[PDB]
Amino acid sequence: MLKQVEIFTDGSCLGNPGPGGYGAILRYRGREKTFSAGYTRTTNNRMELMAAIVALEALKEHCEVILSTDSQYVRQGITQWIHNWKKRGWKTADGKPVKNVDLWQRLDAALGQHQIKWEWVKGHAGHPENERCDELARAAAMNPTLEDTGYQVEV
């Protein structure tokens, strides 16, 4: 039995916008939960954020987590953008709402309930769990059943 919650995420998209999906592996308590869904019209970036959101949202109590992903978008957001978005009220320099603000605020809310360690893998050298995510994400995008409600061509 693992003392740290382990999460692995990936997201994929066939277009911009296009049908996309995500895959996430969660090792919580003594179980390994797997999440995956396809969305009819979304983006890669939104799928990459959705992966992390659904895994964290499954945690019912304060945990110590290690999240592993090769997503550059999550990484940049977490390491360069988030901190400043929050002080600016979630707006860009030109004064409009940040892109995918719906998902970033949703992710922010989840993050805030836990102690998180981020492990940025290289696409070609992730663990077996990341490769599995990629494959589920890819499969899900070939058979989308959900609608990505916050997706705008816009804002």
Residues designated catalytic: 10-11, 48, 70, 124, 134
The answer to whether the annotation marks 48 as part of a ligand binding site is yes
63 in Cβ contact with 55 (< 8 Å) = no
> Which ranges constitute the DSSP H helices of 8-89?
44-56, 72-76, 82-87
For residue 149, the Cα-to-chain-centroid distance in whole angstroms is 16
The answer to whether the annotation marks 134 as part of a ligand binding site is yes
The answer to whether the annotation marks 147 as part of a ligand binding site is no
The answer to whether the annotation marks 70 as part of a ligand binding site is yes
Would you list which residues are annotated within the binding site for Mg(2+)? 10, 48, 70, 134
**Binding-site entries:** 10, 48, 70, 134
